[PDB]
């Protein structure tokens, strides 16, 4: 019997504008009690790497496709903005969802927040929150 120790450590329809949400909802952040983050998050700012995927999808589309960076990946709608933190909860940052150039291919989003309280060791378990958002077709050419 080989033991170890025990160490204690929903959106709505959006147009093509930019919505900045300051979130103070029921974030768990499952530490012991009164979790001070000690390096706070001010603005998370997603929908940047979705554009940094979408412009190479255009460029990937420019020649014939042979899965150079499109190989079964459904990570457009994932929106995995990893919130890295340092060492009873705290309010979340400003969103700035900022849909000014994004495809109609997605109809959902998620997130992941690194819950961290490190004492001379490596990092810890990590908590993820999804967000369902629909988009409005405001204009076409």
């Amino acid at each position: 019997s080989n033991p170890v120790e025990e160490e204690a450590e929903k959106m709505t329809r959006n147009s093509w504008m930019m919505l900045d949400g300051t979130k103070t909802d029921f974030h768990i952040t499952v530490r012991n009690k009164s979790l001070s983050c000690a390096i706070n998050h001010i603005k998370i700012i997603p929908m940047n790497n979705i554009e940094q995927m979408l412009k190479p999808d255009y460029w990937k589309k420019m020649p014939p496709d042979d899965l150079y960076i499109m190989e079964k990946q459904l990570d457009w709608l994932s929106k995995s903005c990893v919130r890295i933190i340092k060492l009873i909860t705290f309010d979340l940052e400003l969103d700035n969802t900022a849909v000014p150039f994004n495809f109609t291919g997605f109809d959902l989003l998620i997130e992941y927040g690194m819950s961290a309280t490190d004492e001379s060791c490596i990092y810890l378990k990590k908590l993820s929150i999804p967000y369902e958002v629909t988009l409005r077709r405001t204009i076409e050419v």
Binding site: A8, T12, R13, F26, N32, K33, S34, I88, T134
Partner: protein
């Protein structure tokens, strides 16, 4: 057995949970030492409270009560400080510590020191409007926030559907006095007159086909709690359901 203490907790559902402890003088203990005090020619006691502290009972934690407190000393009295909890979702009864330090007194000396700590669980425990048919939930995206000044304003009825035929229904306000102990007749008449005549809804049968704006103007003052009148109506027989939500002072 010198100062009876009780903690009352009230559940403010739109905010944190509020719990206040309350010291008192415990009269069944005061006449005890009043007898020996007026034996030694003293009229009332002089117990000094020098260190009063509520700590969040856990493995280890502590809080801070929601206003200021000095180091006080009173004869025959009661004091009550309030500290804000965190409003739990479901099934976690938190506990607190509530330590204290009463210092008794005598003739410029003989301060018999006392201390007390009663640790217990701080769970007394005694705006989405659902459709009540098919979970077409409505919520105003700025409810209970409107200081208008008899100007126009806009609100946001964020309807949340099943996403299954999402284009169905029409709003309206019904500017008509509803047709209803004689002053119980008059209070209902004044309520039904100020409901049906004070605001207008400039987009009347707006026929929503999932946001809305719903511009009002609001031609009389007073706090309109719950904003009645603003009904919707849907594809079935009578889904005449309210909003029951949102409020606006108009001054």
């Amino acid at each position: 057995l010198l100062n009876m203490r009780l903690r009352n907790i009230s559940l403010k559902s739109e905010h944190c949970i509020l719990s206040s402890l309350d010291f008192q003088t415990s009269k069944a203990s005061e006449q005890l030492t009043k007898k020996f005090i007026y034996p030694q020619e003293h009229n009332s006691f002089l117990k000094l409270n020098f260190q009063e502290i509520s700590y969040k009972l856990i493995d280890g934690t502590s809080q801070i009560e929601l206003d200021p407190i000095c180091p006080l000393k009173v004869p025959l009295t009661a004091f009550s400080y309030d500290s804000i909890s965190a409003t739990f979702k479901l099934v976690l009864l938190p506990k607190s510590t509530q330590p204290h330090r009463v210092k008794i007194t005598l003739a410029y000396e003989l301060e018999l020191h006392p201390n007390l700590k009663l640790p217990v669980r701080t769970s007394w425990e005694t705006s989405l409007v659902n459709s009540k048919l098919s979970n077409v939930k409505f919520k105003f995206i700025n409810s209970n926030i409107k200081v208008i000044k008899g100007e126009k304003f806009t609100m946001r009825l964020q309807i949340i559907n099943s996403s299954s035929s999402p284009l169905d229904l029409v709003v309206y306000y019904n500017n008509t006095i509803n047709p209803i102990t004689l002053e119980n007749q008059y209070q209902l008449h004044n309520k039904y007159r100020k409901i049906a005549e004070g605001i207008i809804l400039l987009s009347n049968d707006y026929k929503i086909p999932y946001f809305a704006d719903l511009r009002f103007i609001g031609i009389m003052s007073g706090y309109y709690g719950t904003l009645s009148g603003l009904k919707v109506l849907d594809l079935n027989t009578n889904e005449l359901i309210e909003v029951g939500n949102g409020a606006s002072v108009l001054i």
